[PDB]
Design a protein around this ligand. Structure first.
Ligand SMILES: Cc1nc(-c2ccc(S(=O)(=O)NCCC(F)(F)F)cc2)cs1
Ligand SMILES: Cc1nc(-c2ccc(S(=O)(=O)NCCC(F)(F)F)cc2)cs1
Lengths: 191, 191
């Protein structure tokens, strides 16, 4: 059962579409995966270790997609658009996992640190590119890169997830990407 | 005891500096306010009704401060700076209440709706001013005002509270205001 592990993971993702993690139990994941509950414990310490793995696969997948863009070099607006779209698509394709993993930041120290580690990495990378662009004479030296990048990344976290969750207020899903790209391009190039 | 009510409210604010709401009990608020626990229930249904009132006073105070600016009319960068500073100062002066009321959005429907109501109001107001400025020929017609205003407000929510809570990553408290003002001015006036 690496089969059975993937089965447990797919079952968690499906059930998370319909209800929160506190509304799902181990017996539910077990049943769904076609195995007994003690068999479940061979794979995962708990429900929450399931969410953590689901979350970790989605963030790593966003992160790899971001590496892929990085290694293969278009106008500046589009470059930023393609980077942001990595997150809109990756998380937009896994809304139940995104939403539930963001809620679990409050109550799980491993979820909080997983998210926190990848944010620092995403911010460091955004700043490196901002700085690169300043090195080339294409963007002006205004805010420190690393502070500008931190506010931009935290914006996208809040706005993407608000859109995906249908929160009031939020930008409509169909408008969210253009909205973010406009703010990134004007703040990075203006000033 | 409107005295006793204010005493209960001050005691909650002080204890929230040192620990979370789940670490505070009614007997703690009672004791702190110099009254018995059944006397506490005359004032508040629960601990959480206390947080809700504390939160509601801070948001209304931010909101009034924002009305005050509105009724008395300086350059555009500074106008935005003064608006954002209302939030940085108001919430910055009540960090324990801010932080705990943001955590309570997850688990309390009244806290969620209080926050949600004032966000719609803050966004509607930001858009009205963006649109005004477009009417005068001072800002270009780029994004729809109301979508640009929504992403900007959600940015400030996430970034201010991350700074106040010392989160990793976050912008340093001493840099957060300039960081936000730069992004607001370039995105509203650029493109
Ligand atoms: C072309 C480039 N894009 C990025 C880039 C980095 C991070 C983000 S993000 O803000 O949207 N990711 C962090 C917030 C999240 F993950 F919640 F979306 C967008 C583009 C770096 S270089
Ligand atoms: C000069 C003007 N400023 C505003 C203004 C409205 C809202 C905000 S906010 O984004 O910082 N408030 C909402 C987010 C919060 F409350 F969490 F800070 C800042 C300025 C409207 S007109």
């Amino acid at each position: 059962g690496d089969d059975r592990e993937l089965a447990i993971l797919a079952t968690a993702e499906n059930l998370l579409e319909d209800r929160p993690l506190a509304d799902i139990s181990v017996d539910d994941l077990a049943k769904g995966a076609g195995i007994s509950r003690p068999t479940f414990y061979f794979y995962f310490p708990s429900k929450e270790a399931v969410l953590l793995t689901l979350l970790d696969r989605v963030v790593n997948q966003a992160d790899m997609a971001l590496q892929t863009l990085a290694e293969n070099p278009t106008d500046r607006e589009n470059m930023w658009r393609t980077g942001i779209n990595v997150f809109f698509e990756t998380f937009g394709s896994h809304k139940a996992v995104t939403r539930a993993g963001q809620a679990a930041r409050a109550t799980s120290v491993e979820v909080a640190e997983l998210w926190s580690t990848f944010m620092q990495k995403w911010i460091a990378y955004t700043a490196a590119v901002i700085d690169a662009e300043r090195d080339r004479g294409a963007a002006p030296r205004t805010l420190p890169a690393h502070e500008l990048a931190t506010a931009l990344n935290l914006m996208n976290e809040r706005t993407l997830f608000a859109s995906f969750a249908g929160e009031q207020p939020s930008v409509p899903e169909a408008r969210v990407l253009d909205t973010l790209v406009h703010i990134w391009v004007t703040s990075i190039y203006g000033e």
